[PDB]
């Protein structure tokens, strides 16, 4: 898969707006994921005790992890496809330590797209969503290939 420069520009233009509020977007993403696919919460021993959205919103720890997740994804997107080095440690920890199936990476992709559509309607029209979806599909394709090399089905 290869995105054109035009597609990367649509992706990075909305990401520039996302970076004006890293903590807010990171939190919104994880909460949307947990609300839409509750089974994903079970993978986090650190957060699985949270019972309601209100408890999730109030968790400083969950906000801190959201910042970590968003910042890591941002570093990969800014590479515009040349992200092999960034992907290795992430594939290794998620395949071997956390044991995150590819299906859950699809769910988190859906959650980021939903939050960007809600917060940035003017910069996240059809073409921009199409470009972001292609960028996340590329990320998932490459992570899946690494999972296979590492011995995890995903
Ligand atoms: C956009 C995709 C994702 C990114 C960029 C991402 C990034 C990260 C990063 C940077 C860390 C900390 C370092 C590490 O352990 O590798 C981490 C930890 C973790 N990730 Fe992810 N992750 C992603 C998706 C997921 C998904 C979908 C799940 C589960 C449904 C998940 C579960 C975990 C868990 C359980 C930890 C350890 C949390 C803790 O107890 O500290 N990750 N992830």
mmCIF file of C-alpha atoms and ligand atoms in Angstrom:
data_model
loop_
_atom_site.group_PDB
_atom_site.id
_atom_site.type_symbol
_atom_site.label_atom_id
_atom_site.label_comp_id
_atom_site.label_asym_id
_atom_site.label_seq_id
_atom_site.Cartn_x
_atom_site.Cartn_y
_atom_site.Cartn_z
ATOM 1 C CA UNK A 1 0.000 0.000 0.000
ATOM 2 C CA UNK A 2 1.225 3.497 -0.810
ATOM 3 C CA UNK A 3 -0.479 6.786 0.007
ATOM 4 C CA UNK A 4 0.043 9.710 -2.361
ATOM 5 C CA UNK A 5 1.590 12.967 -1.012
ATOM 6 C CA UNK A 6 -1.867 14.503 -1.358
ATOM 7 C CA UNK A 7 -3.340 11.876 0.962
ATOM 8 C CA UNK A 8 -0.534 12.381 3.494
ATOM 9 C CA UNK A 9 -1.234 16.096 3.422
ATOM 10 C CA UNK A 10 -4.908 15.574 4.334
ATOM 11 C CA UNK A 11 -3.807 13.292 7.187
ATOM 12 C CA UNK A 12 -1.212 15.648 8.588
ATOM 13 C CA UNK A 13 -3.423 18.740 8.227
ATOM 14 C CA UNK A 14 -6.027 17.256 10.590
ATOM 15 C CA UNK A 15 -3.305 15.806 12.865
ATOM 16 C CA UNK A 16 -1.922 19.334 13.307
ATOM 17 C CA UNK A 17 -5.279 20.311 14.817
ATOM 18 C CA UNK A 18 -5.317 17.129 16.965
ATOM 19 C CA UNK A 19 -1.958 18.174 18.401
ATOM 20 C CA UNK A 20 -3.443 21.390 19.804
ATOM 21 C CA UNK A 21 -5.098 19.175 22.441
ATOM 22 C CA UNK A 22 -3.183 15.922 22.892
ATOM 23 C CA UNK A 23 -4.593 14.961 26.257
ATOM 24 C CA UNK A 24 -8.188 15.638 25.250
ATOM 25 C CA UNK A 25 -8.019 13.627 22.064
ATOM 26 C CA UNK A 26 -6.103 10.759 23.701
ATOM 27 C CA UNK A 27 -8.739 10.503 26.406
ATOM 28 C CA UNK A 28 -11.687 10.775 23.980
ATOM 29 C CA UNK A 29 -10.244 8.002 21.812
ATOM 30 C CA UNK A 30 -9.765 5.423 24.570
ATOM 31 C CA UNK A 31 -13.124 6.181 26.085
ATOM 32 C CA UNK A 32 -14.857 5.797 22.697
ATOM 33 C CA UNK A 33 -13.046 2.465 22.228
ATOM 34 C CA UNK A 34 -14.080 1.130 25.647
ATOM 35 C CA UNK A 35 -17.637 2.314 25.243
ATOM 36 C CA UNK A 36 -18.060 0.806 21.738
ATOM 37 C CA UNK A 37 -16.119 -2.464 22.302
ATOM 38 C CA UNK A 38 -16.186 -3.152 26.034
ATOM 39 C CA UNK A 39 -14.244 -6.369 25.532
ATOM 40 C CA UNK A 40 -11.138 -4.332 24.761
ATOM 41 C CA UNK A 41 -11.072 -2.935 28.293
ATOM 42 C CA UNK A 42 -10.354 -6.443 29.579
ATOM 43 C CA UNK A 43 -6.918 -6.290 27.982
ATOM 44 C CA UNK A 44 -5.826 -3.512 30.328
ATOM 45 C CA UNK A 45 -5.232 -4.804 33.865
ATOM 46 C CA UNK A 46 -4.522 -1.188 34.699
ATOM 47 C CA UNK A 47 -8.052 0.020 33.777
ATOM 48 C CA UNK A 48 -10.387 -2.905 33.838
ATOM 49 C CA UNK A 49 -11.903 -1.923 37.160
ATOM 50 C CA UNK A 50 -13.378 1.317 35.710
ATOM 51 C CA UNK A 51 -17.147 0.839 35.569
ATOM 52 C CA UNK A 52 -18.629 3.913 33.948
ATOM 53 C CA UNK A 53 -17.708 6.662 31.518
ATOM 54 C CA UNK A 54 -17.691 9.037 34.365
ATOM 55 C CA UNK A 55 -14.992 6.978 36.150
ATOM 56 C CA UNK A 56 -13.018 6.810 32.864
ATOM 57 C CA UNK A 57 -13.169 10.578 32.416
ATOM 58 C CA UNK A 58 -11.936 11.167 35.933
ATOM 59 C CA UNK A 59 -8.973 8.775 35.651
ATOM 60 C CA UNK A 60 -5.688 10.656 35.453
ATOM 61 C CA UNK A 61 -3.963 7.375 34.615
ATOM 62 C CA UNK A 62 -6.219 6.737 31.603
ATOM 63 C CA UNK A 63 -5.562 10.292 30.356
ATOM 64 C CA UNK A 64 -1.813 9.729 30.715
ATOM 65 C CA UNK A 65 -1.996 6.527 28.664
ATOM 66 C CA UNK A 66 -4.108 8.289 26.015
ATOM 67 C CA UNK A 67 -1.279 10.853 25.613
ATOM 68 C CA UNK A 68 1.236 7.983 25.244
ATOM 69 C CA UNK A 69 -0.891 6.225 22.597
ATOM 70 C CA UNK A 70 -1.603 9.373 20.590
ATOM 71 C CA UNK A 71 2.006 10.493 20.650
ATOM 72 C CA UNK A 72 3.228 7.097 19.428
ATOM 73 C CA UNK A 73 0.691 7.045 16.594
ATOM 74 C CA UNK A 74 1.581 10.600 15.668
ATOM 75 C CA UNK A 75 5.270 9.674 15.396
ATOM 76 C CA UNK A 76 4.357 6.863 13.002
ATOM 77 C CA UNK A 77 2.067 9.028 10.871
ATOM 78 C CA UNK A 78 4.675 11.779 10.541
ATOM 79 C CA UNK A 79 7.019 9.213 8.898
ATOM 80 C CA UNK A 80 4.565 9.088 5.936
ATOM 81 C CA UNK A 81 5.018 5.392 5.464
ATOM 82 C CA UNK A 82 8.711 5.036 6.378
ATOM 83 C CA UNK A 83 7.899 3.697 9.799
ATOM 84 C CA UNK A 84 9.600 0.326 10.026
ATOM 85 C CA UNK A 85 11.783 1.339 12.981
ATOM 86 C CA UNK A 86 8.886 2.793 14.943
ATOM 87 C CA UNK A 87 6.755 -0.250 14.306
ATOM 88 C CA UNK A 88 9.117 -2.894 15.608
ATOM 89 C CA UNK A 89 8.947 -2.326 19.347
ATOM 90 C CA UNK A 90 5.234 -1.619 19.180
ATOM 91 C CA UNK A 91 4.536 -4.885 17.287
ATOM 92 C CA UNK A 92 6.691 -6.807 19.714
ATOM 93 C CA UNK A 93 5.046 -5.550 22.863
ATOM 94 C CA UNK A 94 1.513 -5.818 21.504
ATOM 95 C CA UNK A 95 2.000 -9.302 20.096
ATOM 96 C CA UNK A 96 4.041 -10.821 22.943
ATOM 97 C CA UNK A 97 3.315 -8.986 26.116
ATOM 98 C CA UNK A 98 -0.198 -7.479 25.700
ATOM 99 C CA UNK A 99 -1.554 -9.978 23.158
ATOM 100 C CA UNK A 100 -3.668 -7.612 21.134
ATOM 101 C CA UNK A 101 -5.470 -9.174 18.160
ATOM 102 C CA UNK A 102 -5.570 -7.308 14.828
ATOM 103 C CA UNK A 103 -9.304 -7.050 15.235
ATOM 104 C CA UNK A 104 -8.784 -4.750 18.250
ATOM 105 C CA UNK A 105 -6.477 -2.549 16.209
ATOM 106 C CA UNK A 106 -9.375 -2.233 13.760
ATOM 107 C CA UNK A 107 -11.643 -1.206 16.634
ATOM 108 C CA UNK A 108 -9.274 1.494 17.828
ATOM 109 C CA UNK A 109 -8.953 2.806 14.257
ATOM 110 C CA UNK A 110 -12.730 3.132 14.088
ATOM 111 C CA UNK A 111 -12.703 5.012 17.395
ATOM 112 C CA UNK A 112 -10.102 7.561 16.229
ATOM 113 C CA UNK A 113 -12.035 8.198 13.041
ATOM 114 C CA UNK A 114 -15.244 8.725 15.012
ATOM 115 C CA UNK A 115 -13.604 11.259 17.372
ATOM 116 C CA UNK A 116 -11.946 13.178 14.493
ATOM 117 C CA UNK A 117 -15.278 13.340 12.641
ATOM 118 C CA UNK A 118 -16.954 14.721 15.779
ATOM 119 C CA UNK A 119 -14.300 17.266 16.654
ATOM 120 C CA UNK A 120 -13.051 18.479 13.271
ATOM 121 C CA UNK A 121 -15.929 18.404 10.808
ATOM 122 C CA UNK A 122 -14.512 21.130 8.611
ATOM 123 C CA UNK A 123 -11.134 19.440 8.260
ATOM 124 C CA UNK A 124 -12.412 15.896 8.207
ATOM 125 C CA UNK A 125 -14.670 15.735 5.149
ATOM 126 C CA UNK A 126 -15.001 12.599 2.995
ATOM 127 C CA UNK A 127 -11.660 12.868 1.256
ATOM 128 C CA UNK A 128 -9.776 13.535 4.481
ATOM 129 C CA UNK A 129 -11.457 10.571 6.242
ATOM 130 C CA UNK A 130 -10.619 8.411 3.244
ATOM 131 C CA UNK A 131 -6.948 9.419 3.585
ATOM 132 C CA UNK A 132 -6.880 8.790 7.342
ATOM 133 C CA UNK A 133 -8.523 5.428 6.857
ATOM 134 C CA UNK A 134 -5.879 4.498 4.229
ATOM 135 C CA UNK A 135 -3.090 5.578 6.630
ATOM 136 C CA UNK A 136 -4.499 3.452 9.451
ATOM 137 C CA UNK A 137 -5.079 0.508 7.090
ATOM 138 C CA UNK A 138 -1.391 0.768 6.117
ATOM 139 C CA UNK A 139 -0.386 0.805 9.800
ATOM 140 C CA UNK A 140 -2.523 -2.299 10.481
ATOM 141 C CA UNK A 141 -1.222 -4.129 7.393
ATOM 142 C CA UNK A 142 2.371 -3.539 8.434
ATOM 143 C CA UNK A 143 1.743 -4.421 12.096
ATOM 144 C CA UNK A 144 -0.001 -7.646 10.995
ATOM 145 C CA UNK A 145 2.983 -8.626 8.839
ATOM 146 C CA UNK A 146 5.272 -8.034 11.858
ATOM 147 C CA UNK A 147 2.954 -10.064 14.126
ATOM 148 C CA UNK A 148 3.387 -12.953 11.715
ATOM 149 C CA UNK A 149 7.188 -12.661 11.755
ATOM 150 C CA UNK A 150 7.094 -12.590 15.551
ATOM 151 C CA UNK A 151 4.991 -15.752 15.853
ATOM 152 C CA UNK A 152 1.623 -14.311 16.831
ATOM 153 C CA UNK A 153 -1.518 -14.940 14.786
ATOM 154 C CA UNK A 154 -3.257 -11.667 15.749
HETATM 155 C C1 LIG B 1 -3.153 2.990 17.513
HETATM 156 C C2 LIG B 1 -2.786 1.742 18.136
HETATM 157 C C3 LIG B 1 -2.036 1.655 19.342
HETATM 158 C C4 LIG B 1 -0.917 2.333 19.699
HETATM 159 C C5 LIG B 1 -0.128 3.373 18.861
HETATM 160 C C6 LIG B 1 -0.513 1.815 20.989
HETATM 161 C C7 LIG B 1 0.580 2.289 21.689
HETATM 162 C C8 LIG B 1 0.967 1.799 22.925
HETATM 163 C C9 LIG B 1 2.130 2.247 23.610
HETATM 164 C C10 LIG B 1 3.131 3.300 23.111
HETATM 165 C C11 LIG B 1 2.193 1.596 24.765
HETATM 166 C C12 LIG B 1 3.263 1.731 25.840
HETATM 167 C C13 LIG B 1 4.551 0.945 25.401
HETATM 168 C C14 LIG B 1 4.281 -0.525 25.067
HETATM 169 O O1 LIG B 1 3.932 -1.305 25.984
HETATM 170 O O2 LIG B 1 4.432 -0.885 23.866
HETATM 171 C C15 LIG B 1 1.088 0.685 24.797
HETATM 172 C C16 LIG B 1 0.782 -0.129 25.890
HETATM 173 C C17 LIG B 1 -0.325 -0.959 25.920
HETATM 174 N N1 LIG B 1 -1.211 -1.113 24.883
HETATM 175 FE FE1 LIG B 1 -1.292 -0.174 23.165
HETATM 176 N N2 LIG B 1 -1.371 0.818 21.437
HETATM 177 C C18 LIG B 1 -2.297 0.706 20.419
HETATM 178 C C19 LIG B 1 -3.419 -0.103 20.468
HETATM 179 C C20 LIG B 1 -3.735 -0.940 21.545
HETATM 180 C C21 LIG B 1 -4.968 -1.662 21.655
HETATM 181 C C22 LIG B 1 -6.080 -1.653 20.593
HETATM 182 C C23 LIG B 1 -4.943 -2.297 22.864
HETATM 183 C C24 LIG B 1 -5.927 -3.140 23.487
HETATM 184 C C25 LIG B 1 -7.284 -3.318 23.017
HETATM 185 C C26 LIG B 1 -3.704 -1.956 23.466
HETATM 186 C C27 LIG B 1 -3.294 -2.451 24.676
HETATM 187 C C28 LIG B 1 -2.125 -2.039 25.351
HETATM 188 C C29 LIG B 1 -1.798 -2.438 26.694
HETATM 189 C C30 LIG B 1 -2.610 -3.422 27.563
HETATM 190 C C31 LIG B 1 -0.707 -1.758 27.052
HETATM 191 C C32 LIG B 1 -0.036 -1.718 28.423
HETATM 192 C C33 LIG B 1 -0.744 -0.664 29.328
HETATM 193 C C34 LIG B 1 -0.182 -0.630 30.758
HETATM 194 O O3 LIG B 1 -0.594 -1.437 31.620
HETATM 195 O O4 LIG B 1 0.684 0.198 31.008
HETATM 196 N N3 LIG B 1 -2.950 -1.087 22.685
HETATM 197 N N4 LIG B 1 0.319 0.788 23.627
#
